[PDB]
CSV table of C-alpha atoms and ligand atoms in Angstrom, one decimal:
chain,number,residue,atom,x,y,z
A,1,UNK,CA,-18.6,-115.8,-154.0
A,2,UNK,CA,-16.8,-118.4,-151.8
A,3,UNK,CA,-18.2,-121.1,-149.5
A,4,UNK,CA,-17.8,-121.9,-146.0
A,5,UNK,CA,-17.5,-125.3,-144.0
A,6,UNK,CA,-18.4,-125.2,-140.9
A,7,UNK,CA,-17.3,-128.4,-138.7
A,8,UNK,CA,-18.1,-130.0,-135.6
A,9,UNK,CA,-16.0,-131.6,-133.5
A,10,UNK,CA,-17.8,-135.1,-134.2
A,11,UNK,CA,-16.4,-134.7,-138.1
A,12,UNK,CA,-20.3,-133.6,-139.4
A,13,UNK,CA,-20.4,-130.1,-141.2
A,14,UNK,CA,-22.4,-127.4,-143.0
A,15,UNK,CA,-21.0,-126.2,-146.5
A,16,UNK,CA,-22.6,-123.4,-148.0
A,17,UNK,CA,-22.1,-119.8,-148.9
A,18,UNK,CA,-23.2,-118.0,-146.4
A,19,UNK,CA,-25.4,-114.8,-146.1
A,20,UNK,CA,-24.4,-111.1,-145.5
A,21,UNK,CA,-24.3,-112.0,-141.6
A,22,UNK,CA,-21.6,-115.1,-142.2
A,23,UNK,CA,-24.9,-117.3,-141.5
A,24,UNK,CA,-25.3,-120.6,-143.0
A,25,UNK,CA,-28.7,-119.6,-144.5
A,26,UNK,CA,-30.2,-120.3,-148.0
A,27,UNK,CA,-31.5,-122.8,-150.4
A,28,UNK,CA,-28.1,-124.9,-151.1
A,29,UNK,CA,-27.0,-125.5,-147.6
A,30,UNK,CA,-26.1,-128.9,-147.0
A,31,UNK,CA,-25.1,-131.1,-143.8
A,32,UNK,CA,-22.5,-133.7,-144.4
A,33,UNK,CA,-22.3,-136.3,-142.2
A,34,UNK,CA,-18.7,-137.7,-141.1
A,35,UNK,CA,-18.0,-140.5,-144.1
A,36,UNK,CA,-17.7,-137.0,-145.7
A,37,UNK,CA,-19.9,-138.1,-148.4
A,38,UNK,CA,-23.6,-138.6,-147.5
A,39,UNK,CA,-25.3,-135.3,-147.0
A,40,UNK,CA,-28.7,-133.6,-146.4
A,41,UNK,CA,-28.9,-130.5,-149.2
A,42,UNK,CA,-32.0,-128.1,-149.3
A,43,UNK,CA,-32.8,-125.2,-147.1
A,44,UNK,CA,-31.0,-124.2,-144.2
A,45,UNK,CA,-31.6,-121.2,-142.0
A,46,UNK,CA,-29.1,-119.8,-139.7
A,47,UNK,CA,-27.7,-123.7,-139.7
A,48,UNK,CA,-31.2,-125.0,-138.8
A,49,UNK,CA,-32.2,-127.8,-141.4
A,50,UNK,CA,-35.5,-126.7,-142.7
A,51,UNK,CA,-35.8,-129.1,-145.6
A,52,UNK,CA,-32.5,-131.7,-146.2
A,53,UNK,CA,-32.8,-133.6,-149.2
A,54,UNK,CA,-30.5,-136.9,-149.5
A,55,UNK,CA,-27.5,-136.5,-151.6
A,56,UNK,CA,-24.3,-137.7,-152.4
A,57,UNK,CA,-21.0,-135.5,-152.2
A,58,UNK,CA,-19.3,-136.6,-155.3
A,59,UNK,CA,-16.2,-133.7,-155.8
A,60,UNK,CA,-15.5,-130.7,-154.3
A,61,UNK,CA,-14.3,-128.0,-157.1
A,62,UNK,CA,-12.4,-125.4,-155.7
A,63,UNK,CA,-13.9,-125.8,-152.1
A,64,UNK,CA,-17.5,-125.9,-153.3
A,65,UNK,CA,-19.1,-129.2,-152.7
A,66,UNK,CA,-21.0,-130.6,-155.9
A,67,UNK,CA,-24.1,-133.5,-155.3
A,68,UNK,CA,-26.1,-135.5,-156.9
A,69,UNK,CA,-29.4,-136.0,-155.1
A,70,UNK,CA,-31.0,-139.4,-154.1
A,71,UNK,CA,-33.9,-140.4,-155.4
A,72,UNK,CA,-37.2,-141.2,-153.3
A,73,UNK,CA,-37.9,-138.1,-151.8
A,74,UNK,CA,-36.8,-138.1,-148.8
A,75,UNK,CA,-36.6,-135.2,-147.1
A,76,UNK,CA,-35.0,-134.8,-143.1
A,77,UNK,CA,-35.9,-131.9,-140.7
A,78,UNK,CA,-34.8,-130.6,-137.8
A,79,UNK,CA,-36.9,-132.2,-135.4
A,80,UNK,CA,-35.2,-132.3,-131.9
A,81,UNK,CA,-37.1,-134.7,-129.1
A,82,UNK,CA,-38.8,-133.6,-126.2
A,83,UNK,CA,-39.7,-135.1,-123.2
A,84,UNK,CA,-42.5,-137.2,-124.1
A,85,UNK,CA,-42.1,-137.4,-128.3
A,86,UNK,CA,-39.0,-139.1,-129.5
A,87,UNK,CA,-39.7,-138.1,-133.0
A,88,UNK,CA,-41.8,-136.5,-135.4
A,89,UNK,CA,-41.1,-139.8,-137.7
A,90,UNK,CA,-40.5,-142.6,-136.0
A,91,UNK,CA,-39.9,-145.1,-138.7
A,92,UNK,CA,-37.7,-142.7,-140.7
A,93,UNK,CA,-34.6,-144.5,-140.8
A,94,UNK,CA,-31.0,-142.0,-140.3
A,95,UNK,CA,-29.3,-142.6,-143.8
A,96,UNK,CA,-25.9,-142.4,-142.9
A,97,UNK,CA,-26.5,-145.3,-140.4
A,98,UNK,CA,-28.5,-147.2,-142.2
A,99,UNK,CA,-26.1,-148.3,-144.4
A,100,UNK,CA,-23.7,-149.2,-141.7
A,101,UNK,CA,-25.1,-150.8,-138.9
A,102,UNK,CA,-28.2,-153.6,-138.7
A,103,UNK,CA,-29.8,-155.3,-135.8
A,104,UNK,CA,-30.1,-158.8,-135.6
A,105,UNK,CA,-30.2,-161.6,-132.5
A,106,UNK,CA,-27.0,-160.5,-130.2
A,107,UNK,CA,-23.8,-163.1,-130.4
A,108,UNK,CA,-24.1,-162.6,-126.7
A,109,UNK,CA,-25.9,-165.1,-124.2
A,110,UNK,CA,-29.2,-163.9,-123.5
A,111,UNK,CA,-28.8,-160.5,-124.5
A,112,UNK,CA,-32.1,-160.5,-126.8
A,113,UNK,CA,-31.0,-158.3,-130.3
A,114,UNK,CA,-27.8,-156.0,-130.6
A,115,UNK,CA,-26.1,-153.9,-133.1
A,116,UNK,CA,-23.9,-155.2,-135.9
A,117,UNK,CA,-21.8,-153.7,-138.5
A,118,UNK,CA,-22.6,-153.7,-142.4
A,119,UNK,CA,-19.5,-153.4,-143.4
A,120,UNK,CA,-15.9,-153.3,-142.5
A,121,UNK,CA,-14.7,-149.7,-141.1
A,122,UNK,CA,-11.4,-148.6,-139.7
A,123,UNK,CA,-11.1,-146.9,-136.2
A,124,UNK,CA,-13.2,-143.7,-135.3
A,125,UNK,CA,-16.1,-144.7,-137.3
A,126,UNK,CA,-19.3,-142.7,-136.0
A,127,UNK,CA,-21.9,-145.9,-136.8
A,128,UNK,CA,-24.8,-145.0,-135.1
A,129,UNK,CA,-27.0,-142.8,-133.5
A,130,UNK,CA,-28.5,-142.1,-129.4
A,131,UNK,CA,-31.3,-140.4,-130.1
A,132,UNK,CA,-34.2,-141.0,-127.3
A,133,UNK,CA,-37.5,-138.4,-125.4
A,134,UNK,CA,-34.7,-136.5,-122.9
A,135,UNK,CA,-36.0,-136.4,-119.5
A,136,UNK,CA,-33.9,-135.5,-115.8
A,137,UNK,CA,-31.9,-137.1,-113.8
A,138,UNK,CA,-34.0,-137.0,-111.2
A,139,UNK,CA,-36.8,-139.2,-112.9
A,140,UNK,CA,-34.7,-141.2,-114.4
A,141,UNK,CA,-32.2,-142.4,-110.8
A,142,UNK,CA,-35.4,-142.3,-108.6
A,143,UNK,CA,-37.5,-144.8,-110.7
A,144,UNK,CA,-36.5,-148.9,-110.8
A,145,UNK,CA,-33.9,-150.8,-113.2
A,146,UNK,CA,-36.6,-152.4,-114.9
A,147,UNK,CA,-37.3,-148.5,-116.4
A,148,UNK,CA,-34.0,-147.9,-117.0
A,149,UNK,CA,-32.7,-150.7,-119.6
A,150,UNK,CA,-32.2,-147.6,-122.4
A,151,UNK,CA,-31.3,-144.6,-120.4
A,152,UNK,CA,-28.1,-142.9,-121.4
A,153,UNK,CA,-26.8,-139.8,-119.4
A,154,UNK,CA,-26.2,-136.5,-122.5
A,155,UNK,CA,-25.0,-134.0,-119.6
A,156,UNK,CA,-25.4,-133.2,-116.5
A,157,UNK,CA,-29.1,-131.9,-116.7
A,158,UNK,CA,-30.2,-134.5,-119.5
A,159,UNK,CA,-30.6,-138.3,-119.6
A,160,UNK,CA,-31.8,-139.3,-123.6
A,161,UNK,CA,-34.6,-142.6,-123.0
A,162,UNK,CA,-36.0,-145.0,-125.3
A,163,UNK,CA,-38.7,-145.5,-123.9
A,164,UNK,CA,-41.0,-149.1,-124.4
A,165,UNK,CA,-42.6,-149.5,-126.9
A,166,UNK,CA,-39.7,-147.9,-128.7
A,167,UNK,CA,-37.4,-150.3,-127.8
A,168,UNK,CA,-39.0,-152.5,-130.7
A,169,UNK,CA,-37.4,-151.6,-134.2
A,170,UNK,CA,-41.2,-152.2,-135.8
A,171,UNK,CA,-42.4,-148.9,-133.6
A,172,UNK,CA,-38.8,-147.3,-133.9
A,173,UNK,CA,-35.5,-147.0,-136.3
A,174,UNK,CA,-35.2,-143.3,-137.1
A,175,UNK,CA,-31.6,-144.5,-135.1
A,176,UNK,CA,-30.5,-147.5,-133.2
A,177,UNK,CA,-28.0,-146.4,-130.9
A,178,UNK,CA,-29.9,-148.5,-128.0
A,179,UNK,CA,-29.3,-151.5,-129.8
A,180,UNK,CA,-25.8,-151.6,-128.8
A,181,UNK,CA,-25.2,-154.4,-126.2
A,182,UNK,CA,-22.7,-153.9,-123.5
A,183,UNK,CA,-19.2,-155.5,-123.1
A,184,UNK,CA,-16.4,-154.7,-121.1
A,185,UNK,CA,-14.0,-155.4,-123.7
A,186,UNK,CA,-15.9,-152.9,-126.2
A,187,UNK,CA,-14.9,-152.4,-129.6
A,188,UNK,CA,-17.1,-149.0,-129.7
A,189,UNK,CA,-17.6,-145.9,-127.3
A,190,UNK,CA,-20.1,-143.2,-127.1
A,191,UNK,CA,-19.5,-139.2,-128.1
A,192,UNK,CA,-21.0,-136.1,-128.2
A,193,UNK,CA,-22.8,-135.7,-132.0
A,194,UNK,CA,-24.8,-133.0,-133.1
A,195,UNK,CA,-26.6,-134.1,-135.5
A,196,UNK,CA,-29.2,-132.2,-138.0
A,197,UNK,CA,-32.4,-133.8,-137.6
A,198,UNK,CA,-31.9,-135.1,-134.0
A,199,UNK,CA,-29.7,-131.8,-132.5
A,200,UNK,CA,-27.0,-133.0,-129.7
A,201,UNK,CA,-27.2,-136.5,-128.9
A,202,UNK,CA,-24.2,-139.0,-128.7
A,203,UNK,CA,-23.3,-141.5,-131.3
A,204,UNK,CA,-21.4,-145.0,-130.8
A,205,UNK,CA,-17.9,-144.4,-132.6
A,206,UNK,CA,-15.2,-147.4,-133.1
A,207,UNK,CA,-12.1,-147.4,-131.4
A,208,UNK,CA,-10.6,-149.6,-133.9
A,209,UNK,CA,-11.4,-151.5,-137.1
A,210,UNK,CA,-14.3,-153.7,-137.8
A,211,UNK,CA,-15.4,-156.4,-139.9
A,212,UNK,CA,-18.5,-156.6,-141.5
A,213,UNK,CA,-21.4,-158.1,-139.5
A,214,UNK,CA,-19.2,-157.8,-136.1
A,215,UNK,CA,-21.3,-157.0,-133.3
A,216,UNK,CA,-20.5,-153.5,-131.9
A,217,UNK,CA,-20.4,-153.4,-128.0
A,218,UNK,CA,-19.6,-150.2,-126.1
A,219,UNK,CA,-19.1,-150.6,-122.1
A,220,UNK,CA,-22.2,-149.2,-120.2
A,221,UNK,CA,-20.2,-147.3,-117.5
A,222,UNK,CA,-22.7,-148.0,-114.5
A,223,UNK,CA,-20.9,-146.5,-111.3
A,224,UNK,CA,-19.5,-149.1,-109.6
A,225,UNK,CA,-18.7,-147.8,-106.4
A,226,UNK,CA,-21.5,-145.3,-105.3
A,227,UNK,CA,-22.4,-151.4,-108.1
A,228,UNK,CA,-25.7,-149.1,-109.3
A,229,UNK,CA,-25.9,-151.5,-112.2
A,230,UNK,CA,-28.5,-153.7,-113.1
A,231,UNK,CA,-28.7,-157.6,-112.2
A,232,UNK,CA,-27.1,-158.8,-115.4
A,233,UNK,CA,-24.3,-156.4,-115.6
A,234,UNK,CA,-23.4,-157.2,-111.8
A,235,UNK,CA,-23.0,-160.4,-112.7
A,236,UNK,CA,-21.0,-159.6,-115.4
A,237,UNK,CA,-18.9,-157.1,-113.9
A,238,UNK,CA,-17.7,-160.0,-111.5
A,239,UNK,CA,-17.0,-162.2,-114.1
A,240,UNK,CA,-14.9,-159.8,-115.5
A,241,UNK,CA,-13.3,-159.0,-112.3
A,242,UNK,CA,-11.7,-162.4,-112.2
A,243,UNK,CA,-10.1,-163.0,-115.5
A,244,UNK,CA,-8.0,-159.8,-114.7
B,1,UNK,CA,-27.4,-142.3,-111.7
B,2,UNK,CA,-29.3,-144.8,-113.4
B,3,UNK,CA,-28.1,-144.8,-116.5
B,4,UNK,CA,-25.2,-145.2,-119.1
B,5,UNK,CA,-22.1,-143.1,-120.0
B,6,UNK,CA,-22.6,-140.4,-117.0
C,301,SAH,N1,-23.5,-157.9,-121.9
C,301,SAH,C1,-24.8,-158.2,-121.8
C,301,SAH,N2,-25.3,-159.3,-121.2
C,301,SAH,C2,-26.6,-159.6,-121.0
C,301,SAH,N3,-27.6,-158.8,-121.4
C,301,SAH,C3,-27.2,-157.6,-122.0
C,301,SAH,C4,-25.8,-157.2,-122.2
C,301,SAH,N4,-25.8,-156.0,-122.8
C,301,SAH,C5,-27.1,-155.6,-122.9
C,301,SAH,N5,-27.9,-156.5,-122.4
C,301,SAH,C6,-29.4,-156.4,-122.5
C,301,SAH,O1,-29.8,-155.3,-123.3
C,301,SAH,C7,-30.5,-154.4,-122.6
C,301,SAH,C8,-30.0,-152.9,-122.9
C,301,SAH,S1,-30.5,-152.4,-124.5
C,301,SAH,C9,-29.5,-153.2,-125.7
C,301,SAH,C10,-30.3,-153.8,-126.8
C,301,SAH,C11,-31.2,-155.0,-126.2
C,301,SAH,N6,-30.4,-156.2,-126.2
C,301,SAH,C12,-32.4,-155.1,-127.1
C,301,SAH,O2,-32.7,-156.2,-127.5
C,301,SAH,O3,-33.2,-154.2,-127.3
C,301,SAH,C13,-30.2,-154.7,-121.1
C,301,SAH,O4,-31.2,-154.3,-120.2
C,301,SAH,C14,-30.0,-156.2,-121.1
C,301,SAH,O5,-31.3,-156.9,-121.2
């Protein structure tokens, strides 16, 4: 007769009443995302998003979330990646980062596109997300630079790739975490997310305040004493170096 | 490792 949130770390949760087991299982499960009022509602199984349909949180009644549903049709799945497919729907934009972040030409020299904010947030936004095909470690260190532009380490066993020609927006939005240019005085980080269509991935997260259409930057955190880096962030790094 | 965050 009650209902249950369950909550990740990252902020993201799953609100239902649950089965005889305690089991987030039924038809009017949702997934709410961490602005706490965008949410996927539809059918869950054992907290497995079956079919998620896009809806607004707009009151909680005595603990039980009430939504309005978005028009359109769209509908989100679990669909973790694998190895070799990033996605069951590539061009199936995330709708919690959609409205916050864009890509557009990079403010930085040379750095081809990069991620910008739609609108101001305060500190510990979760903006966007790192999904990507997860391959090893060991394909990933013993193949060139040139491969390795997107690569972003999850865990120990794991490193999540966007692989060309994914790396383009027109073959590729269902997130944009990639699209996040480097700076060693970042205004974002990366976490861990779990995330209901994408599974555990890592987001980009602000460490303070933004303005709309800031660029977010997050540092890369190559090892620089094994620098393993790429030319471009070698460079940089000096730079760096020497106004400190 | 050959990539970012590790
Ligand atoms: N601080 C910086 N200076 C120069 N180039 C950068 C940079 N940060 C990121 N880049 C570029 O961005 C690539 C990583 S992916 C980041 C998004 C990329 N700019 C794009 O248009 O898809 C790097 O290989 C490098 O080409």
């Amino acid at each position: 007769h009650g209902v249950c949130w369950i909550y990740y770390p990252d902020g993201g949760s799953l609100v239902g009443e649950v089965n005889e087991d305690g089991e987030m299982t039924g038809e009017k499960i949702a997934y709410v995302y961490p602005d706490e009022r965008t949410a996927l509602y539809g059918k869950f199984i054992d907290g497995e998003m079956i079919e998620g349909k896009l809806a607004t949180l707009m009151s909680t009644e005595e603990g039980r979330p009430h939504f309005e549903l978005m028009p359109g049709n769209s509908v989100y799945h679990f669909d973790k990646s694998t190895s070799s497919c990033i996605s069951t729907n590539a061009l199936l934009p995330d709708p919690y980062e959609s409205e916050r972040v864009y890509v557009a030409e990079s403010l930085i020299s040379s750095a081809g596109e990069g991620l910008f904010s739609k609108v101001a947030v305060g500190p510990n936004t979760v903006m966007s997300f790192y999904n990507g095909v997860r391959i090893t470690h060991q394909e990933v260190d013993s193949r060139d630079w040139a491969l390795n532009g997107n690569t972003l380490s999850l865990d120990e066993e794991t490193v999540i790739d966007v692989p060309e020609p994914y790396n383009h927006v027109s073959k590729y939005c269902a997130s944009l975490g990639h699209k996040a240019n480097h700076s060693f005085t970042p205004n974002c980080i990366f976490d861990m997310f779990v995330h209901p269509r994408f599974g555990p991935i890592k987001c980009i997260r602000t460490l303070r305040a933004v303005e709309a259409d800031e660029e977010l930057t997050v540092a890369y955190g190559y090892d620089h004493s094994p620098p393993e880096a790429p030319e471009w962030y070698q460079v940089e790094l000096k730079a760096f170096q020497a106004t400190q | 490792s050959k990539s970012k965050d590790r």
